């Protein structure tokens, strides 16, 4: 049971290293707030 | 390096003016940022 827990934690290291997709739920929140700010700043360029 | 009310060729603005490393080409007087606002300028008397 210890060896299975130790092995499974070893796969968590490998997964979080191997793919950029892993933290997508956090990166999506950084990206939407960055997009919303970048859009807000671009509206200063608009003539109205 | 002091905050000033600048007016270069009628581009009236405000801010601190600093020496740029930006390599403008001969034909360009003003530089803009991502935000579509003038963030660099060629001085019209001494071309830095």
């Amino acid at each position: 049971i210890a060896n299975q827990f130790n092995s499974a934690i070893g796969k968590i290291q490998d997964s979080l290293s191997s793919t950029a997709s892993a933290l997508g739920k956090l990166q999506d929140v950084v990206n939407q707030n960055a997009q919303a700010l970048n859009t807000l700043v671009k509206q200063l360029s608009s003539n109205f | 390096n002091k905050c000033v009310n600048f007016n270069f060729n009628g581009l009236t603005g405000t801010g601190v003016l600093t020496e740029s490393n930006k390599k403008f080409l001969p034909f360009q007087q003003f530089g803009r940022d991502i935000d579509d606002t003038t963030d660099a300028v060629r001085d019209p008397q001494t071309l830095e």
Binding site: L26, Q27, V41, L44 | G15, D33, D35
Partner: peptide, 23 residues
């Protein structure tokens, strides 16, 4: 996971990343 003329400013969170690591 990855001043400007617009008048924006991002404030820091009350707890640093060290304080969240300690909790």
């Amino acid at each position: 996971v990855t001043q400007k003329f617009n008048g924006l400013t991002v404030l820091p969170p009350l707890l640093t990343d060290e304080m969240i690591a300690q909790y």
